[PDB]
């Protein structure tokens, strides 16, 4: 049953992102700021298309889960689930 495996993997990845690895990832992202050219960020140097989308990333979550994190963790879960399904599909043995 592909649906059960997909849902379980997505839920496990979402839980791991939200409740376990959140602080480490947030701290690491804060450590590595926006890309800089000649000591200035891309938006500051005179690029108008590089403005950060502050409006989209704002969220009502108590800790700060946003759309981008949801998409990333769901993508990882789906990749893992589909790899599991494809591996279980055939009958190759070493």
């Amino acid at each position: 049953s592909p649906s059960i495996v997909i849902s379980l993997s997505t839920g496990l990845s979402l839980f791991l992102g939200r409740f376990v690895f959140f602080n480490f990832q947030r701290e690491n992202v804060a450590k590595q700021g926006l890309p800089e050219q000649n000591g200035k960020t891309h938006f500051e140097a005179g690029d108008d298309r590089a403005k950060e989308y502050v409006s989209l990333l704002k969220s009502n979550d108590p800790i700060g889960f946003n759309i981008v994190d949801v998409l990333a963790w769901g993508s990882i879960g789906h990749i893992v689930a589909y790899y599991i399904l494809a591996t279980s599909s055939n009958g190759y043995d070493p």
Partner: protein, 194 residues
């Protein structure tokens, strides 16, 4: 108490740390942060090997095969694991691997969140219910004993791996039995020179 009498001690190693004998031929401990990280890694390796060596010795002492055959069931497709001669109903590769990954990752990430360097090596508190660490007088002796036993366990693991490599499909206990079969014939000689 130096490792080699007649040889000068390094500057950064004076003997204050437990189980310190001034042994560093390659000078890897110059950076203090590197020294602390090395201490952490050494302690973790010692603890893991100490927990692992009896896990090899007690099996293969009963009717069960050895620490290598108990790993071959995962190679065969559709295999199932066994415990104490009884097949575990939930023994299969995907569930076992996922459970191991989740549990170990959570435990290790919980461990890595500690900040004080001293509290990382010796957490204390809830990890010791008996409470041997309340008295500071015996703490240094216990730490030195732990370090020495951990180093011995690491050497034991090296010996186990090398003996297994020399004789495929052979356990340490049957190796000791074969050595005791004829001490003057079954030694390291026949493998060191063909």
């Amino acid at each position: 108490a130096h490792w080699m009498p007649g040889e000068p001690r390094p500057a950064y190693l004076d003997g204050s740390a437990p189980g310190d004998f001034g042994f560093d031929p390659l000078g890897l401990g110059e950076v203090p942060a590197n020294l602390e990280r090395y201490k952490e890694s050494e302690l973790i390796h010692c603890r893991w090997a100490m927990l692992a060596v009896p896990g090899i010795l007690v099996p293969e002492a009963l009717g069960y095969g050895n620490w290598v055959k108990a790993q071959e069931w995962a190679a065969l497709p559709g295999g199932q694991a066994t415990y104490l001669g009884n097949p575990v109903p939930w023994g299969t590769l995907p569930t076992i691997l996922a459970i191991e990954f989740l549990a170990i990752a959570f435990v290790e990430h919980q461990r890595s969140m500690e900040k004080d360097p001293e509290k990382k090596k010796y957490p204390g508190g809830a990890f010791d219910p008996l409470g041997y660490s309340k008295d500071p007088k015996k703490l240094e002796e216990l730490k030195v004993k732990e370090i020495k036993n951990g180093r011995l366990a690491l050497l034991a693991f090296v010996g186990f791996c090398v003996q297994q490599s020399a004789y495929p499909g052979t356990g340490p206990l049957e190796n000791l039995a074969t050595h005791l079969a004829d001490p003057w014939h079954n030694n390291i000689g026949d493998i060191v020179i063909p």
